[PDB]
């Protein structure tokens with residue numbers, strides 16, 4: 096997968112990169128720590144489902160949207176992503192099963208995991 | 223990041239260092255000026271994707287390979303690098319966002335930027 100690569104970026108690193116590049120950043124609106132950080136960093140943002148371009152360019156989704164449907168949607172949007180592994184924790188998936196879904200991503204993406212060791216493990220599951 | 227240091231070496235200085243040390247030197251094949259110099263200094267070289275050991279030890283990549291994927295691959299090769307900031311200009315990244323990706327390099331690397339002033343800026347961004 097030449098179009099996908101894995102780093103270990105905290106939220107501030109992801110947001111800073113997304114701010115500068117305008118890459119699309121998926122965000123699960125049920126993850127309170129991320130939603131709260133976004134609401135504080137970009138005062139006045141009206142978080143809603145779908146694309147919200149305000150401060151950074153977000154794709155807000157609910158965990159009621161199944162991972163494969165989310166990936167289907169993101170593929171159709173045809174935007175480069177900065178993202179965490181989709182479905183990981185939010186949909187009750189472990190890292191390996193999140194990686195299995197991410198194989199269906201056809202858009203370029205930077206995938207951020209928790210630690211440098213998780214980078215190696217995730218890439219192993221992905222391939 | 224004790225395994226990475228920043229210098230200001232032009233292309234000929236980078237090639238001379240690579241030729242003697244056999245450190246792996248990533249090269250973006252879309253950067254015509256660099257490719258033409260390599261073909262001139264190392265006549266007969268067969269440029270193709272991946273490791274090419276001819277004159278110097280190169281890793282040729284296309285900008286269709288995402289920056290994080292390239293760093294994943296270079297980390298897996300486990301070779302010491304002589305390199306420019308990956309993604310800078312070639313992937314539409316400024317120096318700061320290139321430096322952000324470079325934080326994921328786990329192999330030792332000498333990073334060459336365009337001027338001594340850029341050494342200061344890059345080191346500030348990297349940390």
Ligand SMILES: O=C(O)CCc1nc(-c2ccccc2)c(-c2ccccc2)o1
Pocket residue numbers: 124125130142143144145155156157
């Ligand atoms: O004003 C209206 O009618 C809707 C406004 C709205 N707020 C939210 C939100 C806002 C903050 C946190 C979590 C949810 C949503 C929403 C977002 C994702 C998926 C589905 C819905 O939609």
Ligand SMILES: O=C(O)CCc1nc(-c2ccccc2)c(-c2ccccc2)o1
Pocket residue numbers: 251252257269270271272282283284
């Ligand atoms: O003959 C064969 O087997 C391969 C021929 C080849 N030439 C090139 C090249 C040669 C010069 C300039 C820019 C590209 C590539 C290539 C290099 C990097 C990434 C992808 C492809 O591949």
